[PDB]
Design an enzyme around this catalytic site. Structure first.
Site, PDB file in Angstrom:
ATOM      1  N   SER A  26       0.838  -1.190   0.000  1.00 50.59           N
ATOM      2  CA  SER A  26       0.000   0.000   0.000  1.00 50.59           C
ATOM      3  C   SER A  26       0.887   1.259   0.000  1.00 50.59           C
ATOM      4  O   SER A  26       1.895   1.327   0.722  1.00 50.59           O
ATOM      5  CB  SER A  26      -0.928   0.011   1.228  1.00 50.59           C
ATOM      6  OG  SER A  26      -1.738  -1.158   1.286  1.00 50.59           O
ATOM      7  N   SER A 104       2.864  -6.940   1.793  1.00 50.98           N
ATOM      8  CA  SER A 104       1.727  -6.356   2.520  1.00 50.98           C
ATOM      9  C   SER A 104       0.379  -6.544   1.795  1.00 50.98           C
ATOM     10  O   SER A 104      -0.111  -7.671   1.684  1.00 50.98           O
ATOM     11  CB  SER A 104       1.997  -4.872   2.848  1.00 50.98           C
ATOM     12  OG  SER A 104       1.185  -4.456   3.922  1.00 50.98           O
ATOM     13  N   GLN A 105      -0.249  -5.477   1.309  1.00 49.37           N
ATOM     14  CA  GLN A 105      -1.507  -5.672   0.598  1.00 49.37           C
ATOM     15  C   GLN A 105      -1.239  -6.513  -0.668  1.00 49.37           C
ATOM     16  O   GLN A 105      -2.110  -7.269  -1.138  1.00 49.37           O
ATOM     17  CB  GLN A 105      -2.172  -4.341   0.236  1.00 49.37           C
ATOM     18  CG  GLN A 105      -3.506  -4.545  -0.481  1.00 49.37           C
ATOM     19  CD  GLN A 105      -4.233  -3.258  -0.867  1.00 49.37           C
ATOM     20  OE1 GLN A 105      -5.154  -3.281  -1.684  1.00 49.37           O
ATOM     21  NE2 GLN A 105      -3.826  -2.143  -0.290  1.00 49.37           N
ATOM     22  N   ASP A 159       6.331  -8.019  13.465  1.00 54.06           N
ATOM     23  CA  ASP A 159       5.522  -7.472  12.393  1.00 54.06           C
ATOM     24  C   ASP A 159       4.117  -7.947  12.736  1.00 54.06           C
ATOM     25  O   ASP A 159       3.777  -9.123  12.583  1.00 54.06           O
ATOM     26  CB  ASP A 159       5.956  -7.964  11.013  1.00 54.06           C
ATOM     27  CG  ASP A 159       5.172  -7.296   9.879  1.00 54.06           C
ATOM     28  OD1 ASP A 159       4.268  -6.474  10.168  1.00 54.06           O
ATOM     29  OD2 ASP A 159       5.461  -7.581   8.697  1.00 54.06           O
ATOM     30  N   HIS A 172       7.859  -4.228  10.007  1.00 51.08           N
ATOM     31  CA  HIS A 172       7.114  -4.394   8.766  1.00 51.08           C
ATOM     32  C   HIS A 172       7.874  -3.677   7.638  1.00 51.08           C
ATOM     33  O   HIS A 172       7.717  -3.985   6.464  1.00 51.08           O
ATOM     34  CB  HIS A 172       5.702  -3.799   8.912  1.00 51.08           C
ATOM     35  CG  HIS A 172       4.854  -3.916   7.676  1.00 51.08           C
ATOM     36  ND1 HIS A 172       4.339  -5.118   7.238  1.00 51.08           N
ATOM     37  CD2 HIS A 172       4.410  -2.980   6.805  1.00 51.08           C
ATOM     38  CE1 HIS A 172       3.613  -4.917   6.154  1.00 51.08           C
ATOM     39  NE2 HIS A 172       3.638  -3.626   5.870  1.00 51.08           N
TER      40      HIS A 172
HETATM   41  P1  LIG Z   1       0.833  -2.988   3.565  1.00 52.64           P
HETATM   42  O1  LIG Z   1      -0.056  -2.573   2.358  1.00 52.64           O
HETATM   43  O2  LIG Z   1       2.210  -2.097   3.467  1.00 52.64           O
HETATM   44  C1  LIG Z   1       2.629  -0.780   3.184  1.00 52.64           C
HETATM   45  C2  LIG Z   1       2.518   0.129   4.414  1.00 52.64           C
HETATM   46  C3  LIG Z   1       4.082  -0.842   2.709  1.00 52.64           C
HETATM   47  O3  LIG Z   1       0.145  -2.398   4.945  1.00 52.64           O
HETATM   48  C4  LIG Z   1      -1.028  -2.791   5.577  1.00 52.64           C
HETATM   49  C5  LIG Z   1      -0.626  -3.551   6.835  1.00 52.64           C
HETATM   50  C6  LIG Z   1      -1.786  -1.501   5.942  1.00 52.64           C
END
Ligand SMILES: *P(=O)(OC(C)C)OC(C)C
Length: 197
Positions: A26, A104-105, A159, A172
């Site tokens: 994301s 992640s996403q 994480d 993370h």
């Molecule tokens: P992921 O989509 O990671 C990005 C913040 C790099 O995150 C979720 C846990 C909101």
């Protein structure tokens, strides 16, 4: 560096032997984000630049912070985009071995698309790497309908997204070393097992 459209820009005449489709996290830049290019560098050294196509998931995949709350960790529109990239790889290069990854996403997106793929195409996916897998706990550490021996999950201690909550802590954001080493290493090993030399 953060944008690679090798599959989209390729054709049957120049087909690579290995096609890697990757989905960013994301809010990440381009279609590869921070981790994708590192994996790519490793793949390119193992197979030559000509022996591997790198493709990030773009299009309908916007990598929206809100979409993480949808039932499968991403929008159904993004799932259709990645699924469409797997179909395109199969069409353009039926002989190519496929590999995939997500962060992640993007890990939820990778898992969802793979679960939904036609079994014939899914069979060609030699390995998949996931980092900060948001659905880690829920999916018991794997991808539905895909062999465990083919899946590698990188989840750092601390994480929280790997333990069921959508909370971002520093661990993370610490997958660079994995992306640079053990992840592409696992992928190369699986492609080599199905192709050899
Ligand atoms: P992921 O989509 O990671 C990005 C913040 C790099 O995150 C979720 C846990 C909101």
């Amino acid at each position: 560096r953060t944008t690679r459209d090798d599959l989209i820009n390729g054709n049957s005449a120049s087909c690579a032997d290995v096609i890697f489709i990757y989905a960013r996290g994301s809010t990440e830049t381009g279609n590869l984000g921070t981790l994708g290019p590192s994996i790519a560098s490793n793949l390119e050294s193992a197979f030559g630049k000509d022996g591997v196509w790198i493709q990030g998931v773009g299009g309908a995949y916007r990598a929206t912070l809100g979409d993480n709350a949808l039932p499968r960790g991403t929008s159904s529109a993004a799932i259709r985009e990645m699924l469409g990239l797997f179909q395109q790889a199969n069409t353009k290069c039926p002989d190519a071995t496929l590999i995939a990854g997500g962060y992640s996403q993007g890990a939820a997106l990778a898992a969802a698309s793979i679960e939904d793929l036609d079994s014939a195409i899914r069979d060609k996916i030699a390995g998949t790497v996931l980092f900060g897998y948001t659905k880690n706990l829920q999916n018991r550490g794997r991808i539905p309908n895909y062999p465990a021996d083919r899946t590698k999950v990188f989840c750092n201690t601390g994480d929280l997204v790997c333990t069921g909550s959508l909370i971002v802590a520093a661990p993370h954001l610490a997958y660079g070393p994995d992306a640079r080493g053990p992840a592409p290493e696992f992928l190369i090993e699986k492609v080599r097992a199905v192709r050899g030399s």
